[PDB]
Amino acid sequence: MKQYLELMQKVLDEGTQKNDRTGTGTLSIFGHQMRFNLQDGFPLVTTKRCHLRSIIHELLWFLQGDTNIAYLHENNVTIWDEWADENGDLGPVYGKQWRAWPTPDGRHIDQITTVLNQLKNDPDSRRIIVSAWNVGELDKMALAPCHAFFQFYVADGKLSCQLYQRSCDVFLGLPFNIASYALLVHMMAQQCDLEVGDFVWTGGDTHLYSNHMDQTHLQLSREPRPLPKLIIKRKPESIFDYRFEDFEIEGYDPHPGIKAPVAI
Amino acid sequence: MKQYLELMQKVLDEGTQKNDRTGTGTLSIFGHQMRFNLQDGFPLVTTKRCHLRSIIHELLWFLQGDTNIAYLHENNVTIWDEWADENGDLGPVYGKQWRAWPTPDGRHIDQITTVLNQLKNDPDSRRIIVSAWNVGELDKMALAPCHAFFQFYVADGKLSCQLYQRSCDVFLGLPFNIASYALLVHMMAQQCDLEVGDFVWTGGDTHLYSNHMDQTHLQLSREPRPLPKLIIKRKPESIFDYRFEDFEIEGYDPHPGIKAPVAI
């Protein structure tokens, strides 16, 4: 996509040499923002083929709130395997915070239900927020959330969403991160009888791994194709009742997939 | 400032009609970002005179962690009076979350100390964050934090900071919000033997009150003046030991102050 390739070129042009936790080098900038008007089309990178099978399953899994990988494994989705203990547990990552944020007085707060009813009843609200950044829970999480916080907004019958991503692997992570939140906006808008607005992406440490440079140069040589279209085949009775088969992408005509590795 | 006036013009040009909680109308956009290189100068709006007395005191107060207004009242700082109960209490707003975030297992987490030692010991970290968005505490707060979350970053000997502001009164609030976080970056950088980098400002619902339109038109007719310079007159032994008298702004040559009202 235009905004995505522009981001990539910026990191290349202006990124500073910066290592990660493992000592793996990157080029890095701090602070960036992009906006995707969801009525333009579904914001799935076209300059390489991006599979959403794992993304759809992960989102349904987040929404279900159980942080054991069993459901992912049921579906041969392996993207959390690296972090899971011998019982398939991750600690209180994403879904737990979304559906059951623990409080000092022993309650568990369902932020997704909170937001849904806020959007229905008080759409002007400036405090329609879901946070995964539960400070007292960070140590027990397999890792700290990269998608830390998101805020919704309603104007002119349209649902918008802004995501704060503290750390962004531009090559490997970002195409998927955009798709995941774009999907969630569509689902929430459907459930609230709203049209889709903008997905606003905001990054903290926004970086290209040095060992993704070959791939970055290749992808930059490619022209974006028309955005595809998201089809929700059925209207479920709630945000928690979506199924994998409910989602179809039409008119996706990507350039070929591009593999990129990780260090250990 | 250039970035600030550009923001104001954007809200004017592209903002949609949007009411607040009281029913007071605004023009609103969702999602914006600005970057202030702090080595350029201290980012205090020059197109109207902006007093920092209250801002400095409020920041020291945040850092002290006690959410009773007594210290503010000691100094005739009245900016929290509207929210405080008959005992001067606000509930677990800003300072409490910064210095003593309560956990389910009965601990209180000092996020400011956490960040300071992270900056000193692991400056590459992509998870150097302070959050005020404590979901289980929102109801007891006099109001939900507008400055929800901030992240720090270190590259090339320079400390940067990004603030996520869920709700922004562009006229009345924003000049002060920028100054407050800009000051904090200077203080933290001093304590970590770092230079100052960028202050990256990110907004959610970013709005101009309709009854600030006269003022907005006036301020837009004015040319920004050279940025002033922040002087820290003394190096305290820690981030918690700053005093009001430690701070001086030099070379501030603003256009005249512009009053703007609030509805009730």
For the beta carbon of residue A145, count every other beta carbon within 10 angstroms: 20
| CA–CA dist B136, B143 (Å, integer) | 13
Shortest Cα–Cα distance, A28 to chain B (Å): 9
The total number of residues written for chain B in this structure: 264
SS3 B150: strand
Q: Would you say A197 and A155 are in contact if contact means Cβ atoms under 8 Å apart? A: yes
- Does the annotation place B4 within a ligand binding site? no
Residue A206: its H or E element = strand A195-209
User: Which of A201, A234, A168 lies closest to A11 in space, CA to CA?
Assistant: A168
Tell the residue number behind the tokens 């301020």, with chain if given: B219
Side chain identity, residue A78:
T
Phi and psi at residue B223, in whole multiples of 5°? -85, 125
- Quote the tokens at residue B1: 């400032």
Chain B residues lying within 8 Å of A129, measured CB to CB: 133, 148, 166
Q: What is the DSSP-derived secondary structure letter of residue B15?
A: P
Q: How far is CA A194 from CA A154, A188, B68, B195, in A?
A: 9, 8, 42, 47
- What contacts B197, CB < 8 A, 6 or more positions away? A30, B37, B38, B39, B153, B154, B155, B158, B159, B160, B161, B185, B189
Whether residue A51 is annotated as binding a ligand: the answer is yes
CB environment B66-85: b (16+ within 10 A), e (fewer): ebbbebbeebebeebeeebe
Active site members of A: 146
**Rounded to 5 degrees, what are φ and ψ at A38?**
-70, -20
By C-alpha distance, which of B217, B198, B201, B183 is closest to B50? B183
Q: Which amino acid makes up residue A9?
A: Q
Q: Is B21 annotated as a binding residue?
A: yes
A198 annotated ligand binder: no
Cα–Cα nearest to A84, from A62, A66, A65, A69: A69
A181 φ/ψ sector (left φ>0, alpha ψ -120 to 50, else beta)? alpha
Question: Which of B36, B49, B66 minimizes the C-alpha distance to B181?
Answer: B36
Q: Which residue has the tokens 């089309």?
A: A41
Residue B217 CB-density burial (10 A; 0-12 exposed, 13-18 middle, 19+ buried): exposed
Handedness of CA B145, B99, B129, B180 (dihedral sign): positive
Q: Which residues, 6+ apart, have CB-to-CB distance to B226 below 8 Å?
A: B41, B46, B251, B253
**Which residues are B197's β-sheet partners?**
none
Joined tokens for residue B47: 């197109």
**How far is Cα B180 from Cα B58, in angstroms, rounded to an integer?**
8
Flag whether A234 is marked binding.
no
Contact B30 A155 (CB under 8 A): yes
What are all long-range contacts of A131-134, with beta carbons under 8 Å and residues at least 24 apart? Answer: A131/A97, A131/A101, A131/B131, A131/B133, A131/B135, A131/B149, A132/A93, A132/A94, A132/A97, A132/A98, A133/A97, A133/B129, A133/B131, A133/B133, A133/B149, A134/A92, A134/A97, A134/A101, A134/A102, A134/B135
CA B172, B177, B183, B186 torsion: positive or negative?
negative
Four-point Cα dihedral B210, B215, B218, B220, nearest 10: -70
Let me know the angle formed at the C-alpha of A149 by A143 and A153, rounded to the nearest 5 degrees.
Answer: 160
- β B108-109/B147-155 pair status: unpaired
Calpha distance B80→B58 (Å, rounded): 9
What does R_g of chain B's alpha carbons equal in angstroms?
A: 18
As annotated, the active-site residues of B are 146
Per-residue DSSP letter, B63 = H
Q: Which helix (H) or strand (E) holds A25?
A: strand A25-37
Q: Does any CB of chain A come closer than 8 Å to the CB of residue B233?
A: no
> Smallest CA–CA separation between B256 and chain A, in Å?
31
Largest interatomic CA distance in chain B: 55
A157 touches chain B (CB under 8 A): no
Interface test with B, best of A127, A134, A209 (most B CBs within 10 A): A127
Distance CA A108, CA B102 (A): 15
The two structure tokens encoding residue B210: 């309709």
Domain A2-264, CATH number (from 3.90.1150.10, 3.30.572.10, 3.90.920.10, 3.20.20.80): 3.30.572.10
Nearest partner of A233 among A253, A212, A247, A214, judged by Cα? A247
User: Is B124 near chain A, with CB under 8 Å?
Assistant: yes
The C-alpha of B110 sits at a distance from chain A's nearest C-alpha, in angstroms, of 10
When CB atoms are compared, the residue of B125, B127, B133 closest to A131 is: B133
Distance of alpha carbon B103 from its chain centroid, rounded? 25
Strands, E assignment, A210-246: 229-232
Whether B123 and chain A come into contact, CB under 8 Å, resolves to no
* Residues B135, A109 contacting (CB under 8 angstroms): yes
B106 vs B108: CA distance, rounded Å? 7
Q: Identify which of A6, A46, A11, A13 has the alpha carbon closest to the alpha carbon of residue A26.
A: A11
B151–A129 C-beta distance less than 8 A = no
Q: Which one-letter DSSP state was computed for residue A165?
A: E
Name which of B29, B103, B121, B126 to mutate to probe chain A: the one with the most chain A Cβ atoms within 10 A of its Cβ.
B126
Please say whether the beta carbons of A186 and A178 come within 8 A: no
Q: How many helices (H) and strands (E) does chain A have?
A: 7, 10
Q: With breaks defined as C to next N over 2.5 Å, after which residues does chain B break? A: none
B chain contacts of residue A104, beta-carbon cutoff 8 Å = 102-104, 106, 136
- Tokens representing B175 are 């000049």
Q: Do B202 and A164 touch (CB under 8 A)?
A: yes
Query: Would you call A20 an interface residue with chain B, using a CB distance cutoff of 8 Å?
Result: yes
In the chain, the amino acid numbered B161 is: C
Neighbours of A110 (CB within 10 A): 16
DSSP state of B95: H
Phi-psi region of A41 (alpha: psi -120 to 50; beta: other; left: phi over 0): left
* Cβ neighbours of A183 (radius 10 Å): 23
Q: What angle do CA B48, B203, B112 make, to 5 degrees?
A: 95
Closest chain A C-alpha to B3 CA, distance in angstroms: 15
Task: Note whether A142 contacts B: Cβ–Cβ < 8 A.
Answer: no
Q: Which residue has the tokens 């397999």?
A: A142
Q: Which residues of A touch B148 (CB under 8 A)?
A: 129, 149
State the distance between the two ends of chain A, measured CA to CA, in whole angstroms: 30
Resolution in A: 1.8
Give whole-number Cα distances, B104 to A50, A101, A136, A137, B8, in Å. 40, 10, 7, 9, 42
Longest dimension (CA), chain A: 55
Search chain A and give the residue with CA nearest B136. A103
Q: Count the alpha carbons within 13 Å of B178 in the hemisphere toward its beta carbon.
A: 28
Length in residues, chain A:
264
Query: Any chain A CB within 8 A of the CB of B200?
Result: yes
Extract the tokens encoding B89: 């209490």
